[PDB]
Amino acid sequence: VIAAPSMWTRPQIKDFKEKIRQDADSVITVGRGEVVTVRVPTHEEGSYLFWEFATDNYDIGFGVYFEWTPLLDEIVPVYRRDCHEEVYAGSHQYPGRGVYLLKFDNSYSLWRSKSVYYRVYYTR
Template sequence: LSTALDRLEATSQLQSRLSSLSFSSFPGVTAKQCDNTCYADGWSECYLAQMPPLNPPTTWTSAAVKELKVKLRTEKDSMVTVYRGDIMTVHVPTVPEANKVCWEFATDGYDIGFGIYFDWTPVTSRSITVHISESSDDEDEEEELEGPVGNGDVEKGSKTHTNSNLSEILPVYRQDSHLSVQGGSHEFPGEGTYLLKFDNSYSLWRNKTLYYRVYYSA
């Protein structure tokens, strides 16, 4: 019993010491009022890093689908297959020689999901890399109808990102990339890595042929 009482007293003293600390005690942290919302790991929401807001991307479309496909067929790794149920993520780090990332893409026959995120983690490699992941959606779920869709049709395959360093620039939406070239650009918000997601996770049967290019602009 005495051991339990000693632990309770020590815990009470620690909580008292923590409550006396202010944000001004830590360099680089601005003091502000906050509520007592806490998370499973015990951290108050005020202690969670606040990512600065990001400007929306500049986007455009073009009817020159055939021209883009002809050009990209001759470029290495610019024509790929995104298999049914898969998500292809292109990781594009920021570079000091440029201030903007640009993209263009089109598909054969059917639409594909597309979205952009920004990872604020400091850049350790300047290589553009591609990662493929499988959808965790229930395989017994019916496939969505494919074809022309409205801008409000959010990808069923979109995932909730738990990485606290990740900010959303453009949520994943199905794009009519089989009808027109989908392009855009975004100015660097700082150092980090862009994640361009080509999402075919909603499709249970159809692979998608994707033509794309990503490049920098000053």
């Protein structure tokens, strides 16, 4: 039993990138053929988890997995999303106590790197 995630996009990328770059930890640089996995823990006070991400000149592989507190669940399949055109967002309920894995997958890239702008949220 796992809730299907909600996923959407919004056209304003330039505004998103600007508000994000004010903080350095919110900007990831993914190297050639590299996969960055961001680990976001579940908050007991929390229920819903929200995410947003964007890239500068290029697209990037993106997926989401869920880890139990070794067992795993596929939330968002890892796919190449064009986040340089639009800001990509999404939401998911908490099916337990565990840890979320945000996969930024550059594995397919031989040469170019990727500047990522990502932000996380949660609820009560």
